[model samples]
Target chain A: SSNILIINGAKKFAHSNGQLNDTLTEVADGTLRDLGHDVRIVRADSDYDVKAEVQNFLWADVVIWQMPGWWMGAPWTVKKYIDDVFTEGHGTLYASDGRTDPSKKYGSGGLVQGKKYMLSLTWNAPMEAFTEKDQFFHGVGVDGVYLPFHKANQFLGMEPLPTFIANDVIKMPDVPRYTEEYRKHLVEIFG
Target chain B: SSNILIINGAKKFAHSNGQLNDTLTEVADGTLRDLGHDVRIVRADSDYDVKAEVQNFLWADVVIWQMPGWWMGAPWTVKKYIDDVFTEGHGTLYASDGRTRKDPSKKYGSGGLVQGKKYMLSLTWNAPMEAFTEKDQFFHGVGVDGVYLPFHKANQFLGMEPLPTFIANDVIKMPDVPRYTEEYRKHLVEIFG
Candidate 1:
């Protein structure tokens, strides 16, 4: 059984209580826990001790971030959670020795070599917006848009599992479909 | 004279007091002020009234954001500030009429009331610029434009014009702080003068 950490990177805004991300959390936790994987979940927007959060990262072999797409990326609380916890976890969770030898290896300085991470994103834009030509995104897919985030994980020596995205969430939500799809993803990645 | 709003998105962290970003703010404010421009400064890390920030966006003809690259992008406070203030000012800032349009021309993300305003980004990176450009380096040759496209596009979606970014690279080794000071002054003159 693998140790799993799920981070809810949803922030409560004016009208919304962030129910979409919360549902994602419940689905992830119930599925993973039922499979006998030791699972821990943290709401990134909640008050958290930085040290304890770092320890949480250390305890998990796999980290899953359930986030909503705000302005084409994770919400501020999510980014802030990462900035705080990861900054404190520097040298403990990862290091910055990539500058010593640039030619041979640059992003190979991370200490969390064996860990893996995955991202589950929910966006208001329909999935077709990503694939359709001359669209708002100019035909770029979600993975291309979030390339920096993928690179950020790689910098920490954490491998990225294929991302699972739920699109058109606000306008057309199919809760049952998300549940089934997510279960299959978890099984394929962690089973 | 243009009204310029400068937002400092630097977070307090170990080994630094966020002086690099502070210096950028000083340069922007000083130059714009001398040019007879009205300027207001907001530190994203500080406590803020969300409504007032929305007003700040409304009040500015040009907005300049000075932030450090944290984990390859802006820090949490910066993103949070946008998510909060922008969400509150949704209809007033950017409308949701895109979906009502036809399939080929759906206005899904096209209504931004803050038209004619401009935005410029100034960033500080601990790694040298070479690391982002040279092959086999830490960045594998991806420049700031690609790395920060999401943030920039958000402003664009909100009807803000894009301006050339000023990046200060290799701060921990050789910041060349004075060059940035002089260069930003020139940019402000060219953009707002």
Candidate 2:
């Protein structure tokens, strides 16, 4: 059973203290769990044990690191977690040697090559703000933003997964709808 | 009275809680203050205070926000500051309004453009090695990758300031020339002194 690990990268941020609210994280986790996939949610202040989370990553078929875009990127705590967890040793173990880690990386590799990794980003900027030539163009797309993560994951023998971007998160008044959308997308991406 | 404001967009990161180290925020602020401009440094901690920072933005000739690029963007605290400080009312005050708040618009038309404000961002990132030293890096220049877009977006959205970012690479080993004091002096003169 490939469980869905929905990681909450919220950083106890000033605006996010009560704005994004914890409800969505709860609902997203609950929905995935209810859907029969084991779900684990980690917050900023959680005594996030690196080894334990790495073990969880090792165990899960899909790992979704979800968070609000602070200042246009991932919150520091989330970055810290990523940096701390996926060390040189971890990558070596996961990637089956870090070279050609992706199942689909080579010509003969099939659909279900390695575990899937996704970066679910909730951004304050409206989706419209990003255009091909815009300032966001470099890693403009959420998919592009996840390129580094995918590279890291690939280094650890994980397959790259499509990214999820929910823009104008601050403008989304209905948290439940967003939460449901998150869960549904998870199912679509990983199920 | 040329005023320079240092906004510490980094969170109370607790990078070295028990260990002795210069908190990056403090190090940056001290650098600017030693340069001798009226410097006010604030942290993004609450909504109301963030709004206050934006109000103060109207008064600053040069604004510098320094932080580490977490998760390819700013930390949550920094984003939160932008959310609070750049609200709609403040938006109107700065000429980003499009027909709301006529009085504010009049004030803006009569020389209230937050216009002369120059924004400089000094940030650090934990990007991979190749992105830094490799030939044909094929990555967004680190400045833009770390903080430029968000800074530009905020400035454009609010109709205040122009985006002029300055970045320090490999911040962990920022060329400990121990010349922060002299560097700050020259930076202020060129920027706002």
lDDT for each candidate structure: 0.82, 0.54
Q: Docking category for candidate 1? A: medium
- Number of the predicted model whose TM-score against the real structure is largest: 1
Which parts of model 2 have CA positions greater than 4 angstroms off?
A9-36, A43-61, A68-116, A122-126, A132-139, A143-160, A167-188, B9-37, B43-55, B68-116, B124-130, B133-148, B151-156, B171-174, B179-188
Per-candidate TM vs. native? 0.93, 0.60
Candidate 1 residue pairs that clash? B98-B107, B98-B108
Stretches of candidate 1 exceeding 4 Å from the true structure = A102-106, B101-104, B135-140
List clash counts for every candidate, in order.
Answer: 2, 5
Q: What is the TM-score of chain B alone in each candidate?
A: 0.91, 0.66
| lDDT tens per residue, model 1, A63-131 | 999998888888888887888888788888778736665364546678798999999999888877776
* TM-score of candidate 1 relative to the true fold: 0.93
lDDT of 1 by residue, B1-193 (tens): 8889999987668755799899889888888899999999999988999999999999988889899888888888888788878777787777752676356565446667787899999898876777677766666565777677788878877878888888888777677878878877787788777
Model 1: DockQ score = 0.61
